[PDB]
Ligand SMILES: *[C@@H]1O[C@H](CO)[C@@H](O)[C@H](O)[C@H]1NC(C)=O
């Protein structure tokens with residue numbers, strides 16, 4: 001197994017007005033296996049970002065999602081990537097982010113930009129699903145199974161964005177739906193979990 | 198795709214990745230009637246299938262650059278310079294900030310810009326399997342431009358289109374259109390039109406579009422115009438993606454370079 005280093009070139013500064021949604025791209029280096037843990041640094045190691053319903057880090061693509069930018073977000077951001085199987089971490093050149101203040105931010109409707117795909121699982125496996133929306137105000141994320149009850153042990157984590165189903169049974173397969181919403185509008189996304197037992 | 202109107206690789210730079218965008222045959226242009234050549238030998242426009250209702254699998258897709266409708270019916274159109282038959286397959290839209298006084302359109306008439314322009318793109322179904330292939334191969338293309346003015350009452354012939362535009366507000370969203378009659382999206386009279394040789398109005402700016410621009414506008418209401426500015430778009434710059442309302446998604450006007458613009462006679 002392995003994990004190359006991030007490129008040397010600098011990541012150009014970004015100026016974005018408060019209220020807008022943005023995504024900071026991790027752009028992880030070549031690697032194997034693909035069981036990485038993603039984190040983001042603020043300005044320098046080992047100062048890690050605060051995560052909450054407004055700032056989300058995807059464990060599939062490593063991107064940092066910020067529902068709506070706030071002045072307090074000012075800082076430089078680096079993607080910190082760890083491969084547990086080889087006890088190794090590499091992080092990237094920093095994206096300097098410079099919020100542009102606004103006296104009244106523009107409302108944005110919840111828009112889902114992290115969309116889980118169909119998943120196939122063996123009976124017994126754990127399944128994890130991610131959903132997240134840009135939006136101003138910060139959108140609320142809700143989960144449900146389409147026209148069926150959720151598996152009884154399913155857990156919802158990371159400020160609403162992550163649905164985990166444990167020790168998945170055949171009965172758990174079906175179409176799951178993510179709903180995102182703020183007062184300005186809503187969005188939803190659906191896909192299927194298949195269980196092969 | 199990988200460009201933008203204003204921003205990274207803005208419309209003035211397109212030529213760097215897409216050379217054809219710099220050719221002397223680019224659209225859009227301004228058209229003044231009295232500078233056109235009245236051509237009474239123009240063949241009358243002929244629309245086949247356009248009065249029939251849309252098929253159920255007709256999707257509208259928010260591409261982040263426009264909202265694009267991929268037609269399914271066997272729509273056909275002939276007329277203008279020749280009676281060559283083309284197949285209509287794609288509709289796109291260009292707008293500004295969605296106000297009556299606003300600009301937004303790409304083409305202009307007598308120097309006037311309109312709040313919204315719809316464009317119907319066509320190809321030769323006999324030389325190509327699709328419009329995309331026709332583009333890739335620099336086949337003869339044909340585009341009809343319909344310009345809009347804000348009226349008072351909602352234009353019901355556009356209800357299905359507008360609801361569609363709403364339903365793909367979110368970036369990348371796709372949705373099936375309710376039934377609509379394509380020919381009813383055109384101006385009440387289509388006899389008066391201009392025709393000139395141009396190009397696609399965004400990369401790769403393919404140089405082979407016969408443009409038909411209609412002289413009579415179509416009317417829609419304010420609330421109708423408004424949904425276009427509720428469309429969201431995500432665009433990459435460097436290592437970041439930025440979300441914005443999609444606005445002013447029109448190309449700046451190009452120079453005619455001695456191209457001739459024909460005008461139909463009525
Ligand atoms: C972020 O990076 C820039 C260099 O581009 C530096 O000038 C600035 O001080 C950094 N900010 C912090 C809080 O370290």
Ligand SMILES: *[C@@H]1O[C@H](CO)[C@@H](O)[C@H](O)[C@H]1NC(C)=O
Pocket residue numbers: 124125126166167
């Ligand atoms: C599923 O997740 C649980 C934690 O709740 C963990 O104990 C278990 O090892 C996981 N199942 C497998 C086979 O990894």
